[PDB]
A paper describes a structure:
In this study, we used single-particle cryo-electron microscopy (cryoEM) to determine the structures of initial transcribing complexes of increasing RNA lengths from 5 nt to 9 nt, which allow us to propose a mechanism of RNAP promoter escape in the σ54 system.
However, at 7 nt RNA, the RII-finger adapts a different conformation, to accommodate for the growing DNA–RNA hybrid and prevent steric clashes. In addition, P110 and Y112, observed in 5 to 7nt complexes, were also not resolved, indicating that these interactions are no longer stably maintained. In RPitc-6nt and RPitc-7nt, the template strand (at −5 and −6 positions) is scrunched around the RII-finger and σ54 ELH, while the nontemplate strand scrunches around the ELH, resulting in poorly defined density. From 7 nt, ELH and upstream DNA become more flexible, indicating a global conformational change occurring within the transcription complex. In σ54, we observe RII-finger folding back when RNA length reaches 7 nt to accommodate the increasing DNA–RNA hybrid.
Residue numbers in the entry:
A (entry chain D): 1328 to 1376
B (entry chain D): 789 to 932
C (entry chain D): 54 to 102
D (entry chain D): 250 to 641
E (entry chain C): 1 to 1341
Write the structure that this text describes.
Amino acid sequence: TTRVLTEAAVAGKRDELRGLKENVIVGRLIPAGTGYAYHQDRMRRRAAG
Amino acid sequence: KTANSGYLTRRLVDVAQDLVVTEDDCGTHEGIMMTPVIEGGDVKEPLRDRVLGRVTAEDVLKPGTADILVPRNTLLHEQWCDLLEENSVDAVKVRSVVSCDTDFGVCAHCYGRDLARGHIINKGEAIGVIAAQSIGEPGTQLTM
Amino acid sequence: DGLFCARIFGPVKDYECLCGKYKRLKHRGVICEKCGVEVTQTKVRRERM
Amino acid sequence: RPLVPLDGGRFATSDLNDLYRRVINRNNRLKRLLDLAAPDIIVRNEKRMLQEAVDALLDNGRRGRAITGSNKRPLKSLADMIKGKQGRFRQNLLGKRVDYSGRSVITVGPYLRLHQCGLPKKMALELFKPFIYGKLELRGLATTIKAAKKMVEREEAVVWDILDEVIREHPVLLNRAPTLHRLGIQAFEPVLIEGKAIQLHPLVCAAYNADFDGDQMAVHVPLTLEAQLEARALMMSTNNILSPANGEPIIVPSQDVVLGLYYMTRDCVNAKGEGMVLTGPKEAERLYRSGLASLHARVKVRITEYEKDANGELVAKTSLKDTTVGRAILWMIVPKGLPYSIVNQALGKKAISKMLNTCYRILGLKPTVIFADQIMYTGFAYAARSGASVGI
Amino acid sequence: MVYSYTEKKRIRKDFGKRPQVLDVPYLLSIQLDSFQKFIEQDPEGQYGLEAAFRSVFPIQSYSGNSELQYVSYRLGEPVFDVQECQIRGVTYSAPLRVKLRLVIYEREAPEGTVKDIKEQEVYMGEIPLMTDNGTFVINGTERVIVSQLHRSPGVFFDSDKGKTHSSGKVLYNARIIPYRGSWLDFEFDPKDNLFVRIDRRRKLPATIILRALNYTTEQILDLFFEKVIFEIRDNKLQMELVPERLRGETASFDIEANGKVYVEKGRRITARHIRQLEKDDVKLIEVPVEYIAGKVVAKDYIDESTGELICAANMELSLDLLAKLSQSGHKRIETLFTNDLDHGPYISETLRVDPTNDRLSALVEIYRMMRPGEPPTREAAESLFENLFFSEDRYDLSAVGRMKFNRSLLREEIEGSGILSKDDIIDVMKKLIDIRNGKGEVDDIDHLGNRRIRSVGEMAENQFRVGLVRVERAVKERLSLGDLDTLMPQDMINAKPISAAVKEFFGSSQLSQFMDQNNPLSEITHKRRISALGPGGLTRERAGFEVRDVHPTHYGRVCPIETPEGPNIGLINSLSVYAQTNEYGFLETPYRKVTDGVVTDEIHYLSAIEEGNYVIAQANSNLDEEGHFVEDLVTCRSKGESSLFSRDQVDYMDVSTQQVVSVGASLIPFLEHDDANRALMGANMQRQAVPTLRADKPLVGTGMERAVAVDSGVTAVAKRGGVVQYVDASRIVIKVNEDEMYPGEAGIDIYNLTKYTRSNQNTCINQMPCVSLGEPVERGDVLADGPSTDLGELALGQNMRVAFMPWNGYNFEDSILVSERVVQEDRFTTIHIQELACVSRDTKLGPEEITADIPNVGEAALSKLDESGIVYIGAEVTGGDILVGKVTPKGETQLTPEEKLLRAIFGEKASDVKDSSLRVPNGVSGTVIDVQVFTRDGVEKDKRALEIEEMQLKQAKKDLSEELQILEAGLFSRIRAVLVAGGVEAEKLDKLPRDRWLELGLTDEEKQNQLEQLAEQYDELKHEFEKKLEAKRRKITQGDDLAPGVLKIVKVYLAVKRRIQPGDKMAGRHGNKGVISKINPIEDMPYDENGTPVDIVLNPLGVPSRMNIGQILETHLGMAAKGIGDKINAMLKQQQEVAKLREFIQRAYDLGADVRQKVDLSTFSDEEVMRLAENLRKGMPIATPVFDGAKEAEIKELLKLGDLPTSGQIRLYDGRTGEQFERPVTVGYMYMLKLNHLVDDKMHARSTGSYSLVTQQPLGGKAQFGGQRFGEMEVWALEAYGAAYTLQEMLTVKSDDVNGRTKMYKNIVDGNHQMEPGMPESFNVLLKEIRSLGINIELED
RNA sequence: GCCGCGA
DNA sequence: GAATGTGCAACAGCATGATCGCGGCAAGCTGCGTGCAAAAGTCGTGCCAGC
Ligand SMILES: [Mg+2]
Ligand SMILES: [Zn+2]
Ligand SMILES: [Zn+2]
């Protein structure tokens, strides 16, 4: 974790919570199975502004 | 050896978790040639076991030329496998996940039917975790 | 002004301020003259840095 | 970063507080030495000490040795205490301990269906306490929450009745400790039992890698409508029959059941009944139960098979087949649409799995579930009847 | 004479077939011997506190002319016995007193003294003592200390396995390991360079330390190499002849002997040419010049003309250098061997590596090397070199280290200085050179001759020595400013460091763990346990596969079967039955000497090193009447192997078949028929069984049950018993026989049995007598049997009728089907004792006071409390019943009018005092057994405490009156005899008391001598009786000097009976285990023709896959034994004549095939025969030893004797349908054990409880109301299933959503089943931690 | 945190 | 024919090593001091209001 955090800190990057582990850590619905339907509707809202 | 198996399972799950089926059919013509596995002079894996539950990337031509057995982009099941083994087919062109050509996921056609149910895999199935668990469930019984 | 101090980090016991000058829910966000303790839900001990 | 309590009003400072207070002490003494126009050597040494203390606080054990507390153990820093094993294993990232959770030793229940599991009623009434409170408040037994709580503590008979009402069709998911594949956690319909051990259906044990020699399993309540649907439609034992690794049926009879069928479908050159011609499998059962015929006797039976060549239809054909009494008896539990040659063998743990696979592939999911349950029932029954034993 | 009084009660039918030579040892000798040699005095300084004192004392100030001269030492008598010490909860220990004297010497007069103050003994430290069983009662606990197995200090050569640089170059290294001090390592680089790793620092060439011993480079080369001399006179340049040296070489030119050609240029190199050259006596011969070019000069020749010389050692020579040395007159030049056939280029290469050639340079270099700090000033380097190695105190090899050193280097002497000398390093370096040269070989690290075992005594010795050094450190300082007025108490005794170190070792250490208390077997196996871990041992992760394997040297020393399974497999071991410890600390095993072809009875104990040379015979080798081997060819072990030798080549013989097997695995009958892993499982599981209501002997055993039961100290053994006088359920009083007696005061033996007492594992400890009344008891007899012991025989399970058959799948997998009669007859029913403690102590506002009266509690809860506020003894508590009423005062000094009227309407306190009363925790029920109220001295004694002291006094006087009654009876008999001797009044003399006024005076001699002496004896006996009784009275009622804060302590013990139930765990002793699945009624279990149903139904499928054939053999043999018992019972039913019953018993006992059992009923009393036949009416308790047990033929003939089927299988009928099963079922009697894994302690369920302030997640585990952790794998499975909503509810709304939890609870109580998720607190905590670093992390919108 | 134990 | 960089091999340091449960101990207790203004609190003392 030490190595990844330093490289992430200097680069100023973002996660965007696209995979399964990120949503599990945050606690939202994972983009798979039953949560796939919810995540798809949210994407269109962001695309449509 | 259980620690060495669990570490491998952890690594596989981590590396494969970001993979779910997002497309129904990418329509790519790429594929993999698939033949029965033979080491030397004995048969270790017949064609039916390897090609079952997979979508053909190209038509399989019987020894009689210009004869179409099963068309391109179809799901192979027990009936199709029996019909295929009835003839003298040896190699089949079958699309695979490594050539899905889709972005951020795998097509539902490049990935064959899910091994849990007879139907084709549906969109939203986390195939990476299933694959990692399938590979890493043994290893506790592998004789190192 | 130590590691565990009440002037910052929020109050220690619910809506009560140090020295007992302002210890009620009626008072909200009031700085006591004797001590810089403000009246809050005492959960801000988890948030103030 | 709470500080630990102990006997008396004394409070022992923790590791993180130790590092922070060391840093503050060094910084305060260094800043006070600045204003005194001290010689460069002492200020230099104090700046070095402050830098070392800060480095130890942020990541202990780097650029030198790790400072230790009262005991001879490293004083774990911010980096070491991120989350458990320096990552997010323990308190985040799928490390959360959850309530509405039980845990107990598992035993075997051969009377259970494939979708059912035995739950102790003492384990229940605890995992389902909020539901019992809600039902008590709904039916007017208790107007206030305190009355419902008190009457649940007292455990009256109507409390047990309401617990049975709540349990009726609320699935609960059981898992074993080393969850290797996805089949290691499965949903079941609970049936209340007067005990303390979970009764688990034998056919799923091979999926759980669970044996009844001291194994324990944990119980989680999907207390949400979406969670209940997911448990019923995605997690149920009747739902996952074929393993998602090779497609072979993971729920297959083993141990006694395999011995039960194998002993049933065997032939002997001479037994009670030779060349008898019987009209149906019912008569084979009648003769076996009456003691006038043996399980291994070779007889000819008039048997009707069903076949699926007609498009979406079944055709029935009747013929006289030479078989044994045991195979004829076993034929009474197989569903329609399967050939008789599926039971005219010895059924050695490979033909029965093949027959289950063919039943799934040809008929469906409910017929093969019922067929597996009937197979396990008859295997246990005839293994008990045979009285197999191992001697010197 | 053949059998003692315990054996005639019940005789085990041994099967034997092989005579025993040496009886099983005490089975607990290691711990007792270690502590005895640690404690007992010693005229010399071998070991113990005396040796530690010799090591430390005497001490003196630095030139202060003041010294502390000590003499002897003494251990005080403990103030409490083991029983009272265990009851009270304090440490069983003894004070230590030491005598030492001041000697102050004259400053003006050298070597003269002016003061010698011989002060008396002083007290320092308190040494815990070991009980008679092998345990250290500390803090009211048992705390057995495990013996450690570690590396013996000395020299160890290793090969690294030859895979480090992947070039195939095997690197040989040497390790110097002391008992205490710095290590040393000598390593070989891939370039063949000596390197020295001292104290695990950076690699350093050995030349610096070689020169640091005042060794010059030329001297080093002369010592470490063989030098040759080349003579160049008159340009001849002759060469010396050393025929043994030149083995592989190429003749660069013609080689002539005395002017005659001997070996041509490039001629034959075979040994024939060398032998021919050696046979011919030839002087020095000339050689070509080019040959000497590659040579390297050894010495440094000096030019006689000028001071300039070629001192460049370890260097070659030039052509001009030849002329230079010829001009200087160098006729002879000394060059080193320069030969590489078996020797190699070493030492010189390292000397070329580093140029330091001075002792000062080497010292300063090593000073800068080990310590990168301040450079030295010619003094720090010398002091550090003295302190690191060759130091009297800083560095010290043990005696075992010295002996290992001498043996490894082939030195005649064994004893020597405990420090390493100059030649020592030279010797080890030479040996390390030789091992790479080819001579010698690398040793095995895991050899049991290279592994030492240190016991409790040695560790306590080391701790006490450390404490003594710490004390002396400041004792020296105190003497500097000490005047003549100072005494030893004021001479800085410092008992506190000694006591602190000793207590820290004994109480809180890695190798001092809680003793297992399930059966005596667990205690026995824990006391003789061998752990590879510890302070000086190896960490679990530092261990490899080789350390956890069975070395071929583990034969008679370490059990190969019994060891823990999961994490600690191979790292923990059990001593074999006959294994003992050598004087130096290595494991030895006994063997029988073999002279000529006859095996004698004389016994030698052989260690690992010794037994590898002799050829050792086998225990299963048949013998003749004279002892000669029956076969001319015998299987044997010669050197770590197994072969077949002639009868004349056998050197030693195995004593017994049990020698390889430890105690735990010795109780598994038919062990040789079981798989090794399943045998390991059974041995492990035997130690988890709990004692039941009634002990039941194993119908089939191994004969080691008696030894285990007696040697564990769990029973009561008559020390010098005679005939039993009085038997009670709690006391045994024995009148000792007159044949052996202590002169004066006579005496009797009193044993106070320990009744129901809580163990370490909350089990019960109970003792019941075996003797009835007037029974003649010999020395070593068994009086009372402890928990899980029957008639002095180990019995930790119950015999159960078992049928091997599948039953409707209720025995599926490893499940067990149990009939209802097992539950009905209270079999497998156990008593568990739990201790509850409540303490009263002072606080801010006053004393926490204990009363029955408690504010705001109804009269319902006070029904079971006495007038002092404690439960009535025997009251059945359940749930949260009140145990002791304790009230804690609260603070208020401002009586507001509301409080005033509150105190007016209610009591004076007005319930101001809060209650903190001991309530039974939920889920705990049972009867109250005992209360142990403890009070502080000075405070008023409790009302129940008065009854406790009254009971103690009554018991003390009751148990003390017996000897006084006997003594006054003897005195009265003597007085009566005296009065009959003269002036006898017959019964009238007995009518009047006081001997009828001492029968007046009668004769003058009788009045002056007899009567006066009798009266004096009476008076002094009465006075001594009163004195001792008053002393005991005062001792019992003494105010306890309790802890400061604590004022009063009360303890409550609860007893509950745990009956068998489905989920419970039951197992045999062959590794077969399971959980019961169903308790079947009597009518539903299978029954035979006679109608008796079976008790346990087991699945046959577990046998063929686990290879537990011992299961089937034991079931068959137990069936045979129970058949014999049934025959005996049936014969007893009809009350037939004793002669025919004796005949049947005799016929049954003599059955076998040449069995070494000579039990005969002809010499057996008729009443004794009746009693024996009544004792074994249940079944004949036979005993089959481990590796020589009953054969199938013997079992079948035993079955034939008892009128039972030979095959061991009977026809079984279904209990429900009445239909016979098609195949016969093997019905037998098997010894089943109820393990300590019960569902009453493994059933947990939580809906909503307490959480942690950090991460806001629920707590963990039972006894804390925690939730089951949802680890990473189950979340992976949830993701694989696709159940995202279940995962979300399991991640947020169940664990860490502070408001989500409450919203979910409210919705469910309402009945909505709505999620309403949120943000887990764990991720917010993680964000705060990351922001607390220099890293900024935030959530975007 | 050590120590022992269950799958 | 001597000179100058690129490839390269040994080497030292970092990171990792299955999951879920159960029972017992032993600790872990942390840092002044100073003399004075400046303030606040307290105690011995006298006061009025209720019975
Ligand atoms: Mg198991
Ligand atoms: Zn695709
Ligand atoms: Zn304030």
